[PDB]
Design a protein around this ligand. Structure first.
Ligand SMILES: CC(=O)SCCNC(=O)CCNC(=O)[C@H](O)C(C)(C)COP(=O)(O)OP(=O)(O)OC[C@H]1O[C@@H](n2cnc3c(N)ncnc32)[C@H](O)[C@@H]1OP(=O)(O)O
Length: 154
């Protein structure tokens, strides 16, 4: 019962998810510390498409959010990945990678057409993202058009 496992969030997790998110982003120099707010706003708007936690000994160690993105104003089965957050002390152990791979697998399994993200130049290549935006297509390549994240992201 000391094993880490990944599962979908439940309503009872909201405070802890936000605590982990805010801890992860607190020292991030370009962060305006809105990532916790964003997750909660996505949830409030029913736009938190997928929300997974990594849990061990009843504690949330990490979290990932996915939400729909519009392309040229249209819903085309594309999602944005983020935020993803792991407790600072438990980073560099593969938790983030496990959350990302599992989240992508669940999106694909539910009929998604692709995922986009903004982030580190090289890290996300291990999940198939290719290069602003990085993109992972589950079928045809990403259709052209302005990418808009949900209003929660501002
Ligand atoms: C799209 C977005 O959401 S961008 C915003 C991302 N989130 C943040 O910036 C918040 C602060 N940062 C974090 O919370 C974390 O650093 C995250 C979520 C980005 C990554 O979570 P982690 O659990 O540390 O991810 P993970 O362990 O899979 O990989 C991190 C690095 O540790 C390395 N690593 C992990 N496990 C091992 C291991 N057993 N041996 C050697 N290296 C390892 C990884 O290769 C990676 O380094 P690399 O990019 O040079 O290859």
């Amino acid at each position: 019962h000391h094993h880490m496992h990944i599962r979908k969030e439940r309503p009872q997790d909201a405070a802890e998810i936000r605590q982990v998110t805010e801890a992860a982003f607190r020292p991030v120099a370009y962060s305006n510390q809105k990532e916790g707010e964003i997750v909660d706003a996505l949830r409030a708007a029913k736009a938190l498409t997928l929300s997974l936690v990594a849990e061990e000994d009843g504690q949330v160690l990490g979290h990932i959010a996915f939400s729909p993105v519009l392309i040229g104003g249209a819903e085309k089965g594309w999602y944005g990945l983020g935020p993803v957050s792991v407790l600072p002390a438990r980073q560099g152990e593969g938790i983030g990678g496990k959350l990302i791979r599992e989240g992508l697998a669940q999106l694909r399994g539910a009929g998604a057409r692709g995922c986009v993200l903004l982030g580190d130049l090289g890290y996300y290549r291990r999940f198939g993202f290719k290069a602003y935006f990085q993109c992972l297509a589950f079928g045809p390549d990403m259709p052209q058009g302005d990418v808009a994240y949900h209003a929660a992201f501002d």
